[PDB]
């Protein structure tokens, strides 16, 4: 149960069965997908991104570590992804509002997490929970297919579905800790808050995709008003 792809090993672990590489895959996944969202949505210019290949078939723009600001965003995503190892991350979301500091967004790209006990069969315990709990781990090749699906869906959604973002907007990363997460444990780059994000009552919701490695599960959603 391993992926024998040259293009895949450049960005992702070839094995995702065991707990560690599963969480590692989640980290790399968060990086790739949110980089794709950032570029495809034109929140950041192409200069911040360097082009990479997940597959010989598809290419995306991944945040460049050389560029300082992009490195900052990348280390932010790295911290959030690293949280999945401890299992203290419930959700990470790219939130777009008109004014800086708003709790009501005009656009949201959310990624919701689920952690499995033991060998990675039983889910630990929200509306997103049940669906992912139903899933089984079907091998690394299937996980590759899921990643491919997510990225393609992201690019297609941003370019051929969504309307362009408004002239001025505030984007930022907001997350939610699990119930298990200690009060002294804080994700680097993320100041604590008593506010997450809220949505309009008529906001449109579309599902981008999901990922089921060995011991973890993710669900990528997209809320938007531009849609």
């Amino acid at each position: 149960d391993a992926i024998d792809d040259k293009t895949w090993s450049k960005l992702f672990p070839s094995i995702v069965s065991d707990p560690d590489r599963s969480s590692n895959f989640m980290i790399r996944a968060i990086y790739v997908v949110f980089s794709a969202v950032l570029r495809q949505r034109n929140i950041l210019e192409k200069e911040y991104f360097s082009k990479n290949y997940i597959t010989e078939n598809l290419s995306c723009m991944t945040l460049s570590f050389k560029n300082l600001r992009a490195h900052q965003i990348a280390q932010l995503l790295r911290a959030a992804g690293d949280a999945t190892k401890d299992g203290f991350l419930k959700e990470i979301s790219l939130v777009v509002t008109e004014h800086d500091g708003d709790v009501e967004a005009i656009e949201v790209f959310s990624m919701k997490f689920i952690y499995f006990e033991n060998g990675g069969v039983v889910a630990r315990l929200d509306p997103h929970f049940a669906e992912l709990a139903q899933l089984r781990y079907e091998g690394a090749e299937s996980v590759r297919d899921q990643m491919v699906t997510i990225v393609r869906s992201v690019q297609f959604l941003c370019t051929k579905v969504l309307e362009p973002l408004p002239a001025e907007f505030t984007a930022n990363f907001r997350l939610k800790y699990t119930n298990d997460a200690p009060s002294n444990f804080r994700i680097d780059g993320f100041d604590d808050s008593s506010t997450f994000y809220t949505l309009p009552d008529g906001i449109q919701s579309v599902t981008i995709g999901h990922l089921r490695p060995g011991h973890h599960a993710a669900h990528m959603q997209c809320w938007s008003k531009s849609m």
Binding site: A171, N172, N179, D192
Partner: peptide
Amino acid sequence: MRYGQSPNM
């Protein structure tokens, strides 16, 4: 219950 935030743009 508990949340975290970041600055971008």
